[PDB]
Design a protein around this nucleic acid. Structure first.
Lengths: 97, 109, 102, 83, 95, 97, 83, 120, 95
DNA sequence: ATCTTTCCTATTGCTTTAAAGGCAGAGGACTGTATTGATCAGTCCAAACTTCTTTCTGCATGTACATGGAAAACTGGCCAAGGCAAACACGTCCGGAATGATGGTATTTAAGAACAAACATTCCCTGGTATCAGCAAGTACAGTGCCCTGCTGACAGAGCAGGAGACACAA
DNA sequence: TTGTGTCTCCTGCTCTGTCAGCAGGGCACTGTACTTGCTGATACCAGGGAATGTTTGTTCTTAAATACCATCATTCCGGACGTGTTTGCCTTGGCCAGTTTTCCATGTACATGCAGAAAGAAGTTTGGACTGATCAATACAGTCCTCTGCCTTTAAAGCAATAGGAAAGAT
């Protein structure tokens, strides 16, 4: 029979993989497109520096990573192990956002 | 005649630039006047903190079998030390990642 | 007064049909029965509990709520459309082939 | 030229990877829309200040230092690009 | 050539050669260190300026920097930094 | 039998009271003693202006009220209405304390 | 002159009141020790900065402005005391 | 002869002190120089913000049947408004309070069956 | 002779009378208003100083104040306050 | 407990790219002296604090009763994890262009410096009203005992259909 | 007088009346706490007069900003191939949510003593004003050398392939 890891094993493997690495986890080009899409609502024909886009992606990824850490803590607080939208809402509310 | 010039970094025994610190203090509009010992004190403190962080980062790099400090090692040094982590709590390090940490309940039975 | 020659199912059917709105609550049904039969004026609890049991048991009666808060309290009861003329033609005391949903 | 609906470019695998880096084991199905909303709000709040700093300098290029100042103004200081 | 842009690269490298003689440092890590030095410098200088303004003094002496260091740095880091700063000021005062 | 309000009624009544009033909730002199005691380990024989102790007490009360609001959110998140040290620890941890 | 055990002056009903203003309805028995510890840490952090400011002024009286600057130094800005 | 003096607040039509604001800008070491229009703009902005908060606080006091603005009214005006609440989010107000707010989960259960209290 | 203690109390009171002729304001409320005005002044002035330093401007003009008002204030405040400041500067320049 | 599969880590070889080393020069740090404004040392006083006493409750502590919320146990189904295959859209580079940020010079325009007048702001003395304290009507909502209305299950007992005995119909 | 069909009495399944009992849901009385109204009082805020320091007007000047041009570098745009990633589908397992049960740990209310708060006074401390002294920073000019930009060299790290060990999952 084909081999199949039980649920949660590959999840932990993936956690160990990604907490050990430094690379950016969002694809660069779609994030750049999103940045430009949001930017045009404030001023048309905006130029951008590549390093500005990289810094934006760095800040966004760090913010989301910390937010997911707090979300995971909020989930484990309720004795669950699956994160739900209410977990993110609680994390944002307590964090002061 | 004028004697041999000696940088105030040499007088204080420091490695950081006392003159640059003094000029930045004057140009920064912190106050109208700047004392003579203030740049020396500030340069000494900056040198000390830099030496602390570099020592911990070098230890981390040696642990990872790397002879060059990279942002990952700076992150490891900063977050593994309680005092530095409390100093740089709000700072984000580019290309830093996070410390390896899995909650206990998520582990298999 | 002698007991009416009508079963409780027949009495409920007549009370529902005679109503202008084709529905009545328990209090209204009790008032109607007592008014039209002085025999049921006394010994309330017996036949009132019997009527409650019959309403809860027989499928030909279905309850309906009071929409604009009315005088309030109680719930109306309505004959099921599929019941038909079960008690007609002198079979008041016993209904042949008691109505069922399925 | 104009861009319409790139918020969906933050795909489900990307959000999964971000959650994995945070120590998340199991992810609900509705997390993705919530994460996209939160990310969009954060990006708007940062790019507004970045564009403001760019306008005040009378420049049309949003440089790295503009983003760094916008972040540091919000208590999210960033090392690496600030120079 | 473009306008000169100054940084703490050489000084942090010298401190590195002091603590760990046989190691190097990357350019991205170097920029992170420069940003750290600038951040700490700005924090200390701003706190010193606020201290001077609170006391209606027109000058930032070594005392203001010492109080700023004691306010900002936590725990043993603060006292070690104070000791180093006092040592440097004492050596400089001897000319 | 003598009257006895059911549990939860008095708690809600007291919530409605202390959310409508502005008075200080900690006693004054014991907080003053605590403030002076904590000050000894930093420098001996200090003196305190009355307004200084008042400012400290105001800030402490505001901080604790915020902390308990976030603790209450954490407790309600876990399908509970009783606050526990777990809740305070989580609230402090998310806020970065 | 020396004071030893004033942390217990943060009485149980005082903590109950402070929580009730937060909307808390039901309180565990172990909340009070945690609250005392948290309050003591907060007070130590604030008073260290206040005493540092007083020392730098070469004074021996701790003034309200010292407390206000200490709070504002920790992102707890306070209004109504001459700030 | 020297003309009759007019305060820069009078010229700009403001109520806040433009001269005092200029002095505070120069003394605070915010910059080496201060433009002539910067005090006027800053005084106008501060007056506008003061007018906003005071109008909202006056509304709050009228709601409470009081004519004197007190710290509680300032707190209510600041926290009931989204924008002022966001501007003053990390600000404490002495002798203020909190917005009346009880989480809906905590409110009592209106049980359809309500008899004398017994074990669960 | 003791030193004078300057404040904004008279001006805050004049604005209060402008918007609400009938209402009053207590001493502690006035103190909170003074603290608020000082805090907003410090925020806007510091942000303007940082804006000038970023562009290496030596002078804080009305443009710096406008940019600082846009950065600090949220939403409709950042628009109404900008309109008020522009109107006041225009009237000042008209005389 | 043992076997199979998958993953991870570790080692060796190649390469490529990123950091260390060398040189030029210019801009900014260093030296020396006069100026001056800031800070420091000593005295004084009043106002602000600290210390002690007594009052007078209103608060915190203690205790007892018990209610209902938290936690444990169980069940199940449905949500999400794991894997596969196809499509696609990202990654990387390469070039064209046109956009704009920087640098330089003339100028022009707005702010700093200085001095005098005066005028606005702060501090001190007086009415009057907005607030606080206490008692008391009135209202709002909880606690709960009671009542009505539903429903399960069983028992008890008449109602009408089917089968057998008695009678009458057929022969 | 004998054989067979139909009527009447009895039996049997259907149906209704009755009771007991337990559950939901709603009504009205009792009771406690909060809000509002009234009066007295008191303290506190706005209005009027004296002192001072700070703002405004005027002139000179000087440096920061503006305007125009130039230039080069850097960011947008498009094209192309290659292949890792994403998306849709299927299978199933285990985790979330709902239900039930137990009891204990929290809440409510009363009894009690005590120490917190208020008022007053006395003692005492020191923060800030004031004066004169001094000393350390700033301003200016000369000068010389430390730090940053450009270029070159090589070794640290990335990439590829392979091999061995750890660990998960199933029998």
């Amino acid at each position: 029979k084909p081999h199949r890891y039980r649920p949660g094993t590959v999840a932990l493997r993936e956690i160990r993989r990604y907490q050990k690495s430094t690379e950016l986890l969002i694809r660069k080009l779609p994030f750049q497109r999103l940045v430009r899409e949001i930017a045009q609502d404030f001023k048309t024909d905006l130029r951008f520096q590549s390093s500005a886009v990289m810094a934006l992606q760095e800040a966004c990824e760090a913010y989301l990573v910390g937010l997911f850490e707090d979300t995971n803590l909020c989930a484990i607080h309720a004795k669950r192990v699956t994160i739900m939208p209410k977990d993110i809402q609680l994390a944002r509310r307590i964090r002061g956002e | 005649a004028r004697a041999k010039a000696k940088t105030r970094s040499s007088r204080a025994g420091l490695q950081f630039p006392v003159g640059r610190v003094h000029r930045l203090l004057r140009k920064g509009n912190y106050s109208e006047r700047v004392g003579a010992g203030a740049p020396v004190y500030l340069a000494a403190v900056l040198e000390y903190l830099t030496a602390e962080i570099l020592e911990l980062a070098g230890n981390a790099a040696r642990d990872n079998k790397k002879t060059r400090i990279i942002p990952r090692h700076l992150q490891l040094a900063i977050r593994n030390d309680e005092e530095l982590n409390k100093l740089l709590g709000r700072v984000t390090i580019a290309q830093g990642g996070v410390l390896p940490n899995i909650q206990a309940v998520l582990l298999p039975k | 007064h002698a007991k009416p020659p009508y079963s409780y199912i027949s009495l409920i059917t007549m009370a529902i049909q005679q109503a202008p709105s084709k529905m009545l609550t328990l209090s209204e049904i009790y008032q109607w029965i007592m008014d039209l039969f002085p025999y049921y004026r006394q010994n309330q609890q017996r036949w009132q509990n019997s009527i409650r049991h019959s309403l809860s048991f027989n499928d030909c009666f279905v309850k309906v709520a009071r929409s604009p808060d009315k005088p309030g309290k109680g719930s109306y009861w309505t004959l099921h459309p599929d019941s038909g003329n079960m008690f007609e033609n002198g079979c008041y005391l016993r209904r042949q082939k008691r109505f069922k949903c399925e | 030229k104009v861009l319409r609906d790139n918020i969906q470019g933050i795909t489900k695998p990307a959000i999964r990877r971000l959650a994995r880096r945070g120590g998340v084991k199991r992810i609900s199905g509705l997390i993705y829309e919530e994460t996209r909303g939160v990310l969009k709000v954060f990006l708007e709040n940062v790019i507004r200040d970045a564009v403001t700093y760019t306008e005040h300098a009378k420049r049309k290029t949003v440089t790295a230092m503009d983003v760094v100042y916008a972040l540091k103004r919000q208590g999210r200081t960033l090392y690496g690009f600030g120079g | 050539k473009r306008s000169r842009k100054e940084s703490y690269s050489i000084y942090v490298y010298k401190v590195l050669k002091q603590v760990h003689p046989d190691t190097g440092i990357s350019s991205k890590a170097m920029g992170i260190m420069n940003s750290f030095v600038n951040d700490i410098f700005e924090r200390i200088a701003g706190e010193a300026s606020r201290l001077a303004h609170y006391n209606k003094r027109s000058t930032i002496t070594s005392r203001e920097i010492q109080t700023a260091v004691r306010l900002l740095l936590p725990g043993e880091l603060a006292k070690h930094a104070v000791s180093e700063g006092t040592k440097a000021v004492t050596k400089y005062t001897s000319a």
